[PDB]
Swiss-Prot record, chain B:
GO terms, molecular function: DNA binding; DNA-binding transcription factor activity
Residues of the full protein shown: 98 to 274 of 274
Phylogenetic lineage: Bacteria, Pseudomonadati, Pseudomonadota, Gammaproteobacteria, Enterobacterales
Mutagenesis or variant effect for residue 52 to D: Strongly reduced promoter binding and tetramerization
Residue sites binding glyoxylate per the record: 66-67, 114, 124, 141-143
Impact reported for residue 49 to D: Strongly reduced promoter binding and tetramerization
Gene: iclR
Official protein name in the record: Transcriptional repressor IclR
Length: 178, 178
């Protein structure tokens, strides 16, 4: 993430907010703890909504942005990170088993989006996809984050499609200007 | 009754203490006497990712919010009986029989209760604040997701907002015109 890049990304976020009806975030990876740090955001206008602050951190194993990044790493890499960092249980849905988490990451790669299903906070869902540089390194993720009351089970795939398309547009934007 | 920044400053700790105890966003709204609306004039947000975050200057509908119905409950049955009510949700009380019965109950329990009548997944509990002439001018509400404001919590939350509104009433009486 750059600055004239940040400037192109921003209207992509605004349009995604409008299209999804939910708050949208972009985050970069903390290489120390593998938390995702929120560096930009466009909130929706719903009274009830996701409103984490800029510079706020989303958990490695338990957020959309966290798991989107984690999904890009190898089996061993993730085995080592889990061995180090542990799997704090935020909620009763948090994936605190390595086999369960690893399965979820495999599925994340297969479908093109991560899905936080009240793993970070009760009532909270997020869908996220990474943004890639010329080395296929994930250098950013976009997430759509909102209440289970609106991000309903029948909408998850549709929401996943929307975040895929958004993350794609930024990857292409970076490709074009770099 | 008249709220100034100075008075908001004086009562702020009560709102902050209420956000802390309830873990939810606390709002203070005033009744516009000309246009019969409830206008948010202060707020202490909770730190949850997912929370209620209406803007300052935001309006909460009369028939369909905690603050609104807390104001309506202060009126005589004739005053309420005396034009089409918007349905925000399937739960919005648009039938005058139903509305009046809810206001009846509000007066008996000491607090209003918006149960997804304004927005799906949003609950609020509120009670009025009174000036030196015992006239209702403001209301304090606790507002948050049905995920956290669960059925086992509604009465307890009601009690918290009665006690808070009373403390605002007391503080106002002593600091009137500040």
């Amino acid at each position: 993430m750059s600055r004239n890049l940040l400037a192109i990304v921003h209207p992509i976020l605004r349009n995604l907010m409008e299209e999804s009806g939910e708050t949208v975030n972009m985050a970069v990876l903390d290489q120390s703890d593998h938390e995702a740090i929120i560096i930009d955001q466009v909130q929706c206008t719903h009274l009830m909504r996701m409103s984490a602050p800029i510079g706020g951190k989303l958990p490695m194993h338990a957020s959309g942005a966290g798991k989107a990044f984690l999904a890009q790493l190898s089996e061993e890499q993730v085995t080592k990170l889990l061995h180090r960092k542990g799997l704090h249980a935020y909620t009763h849905a948090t994936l605190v088993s390595p086999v369960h988490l690893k399965e979820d990451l495999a599925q994340t790669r297969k479908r093109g989006y991560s899905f936080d299903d009240e793993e970070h906070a009760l009532g909270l869902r997020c869908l996220a996809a990474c943004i890639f540089d010329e080395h296929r390194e994930p250098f950013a993720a976009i997430s759509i984050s909102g209440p289970i009351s609106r991000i309903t089970d029948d909408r998850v795939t549709e929401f996943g499609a929307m975040v895929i398309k958004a993350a794609k547009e930024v990857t292409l934007a970076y490709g074009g200007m770099r």
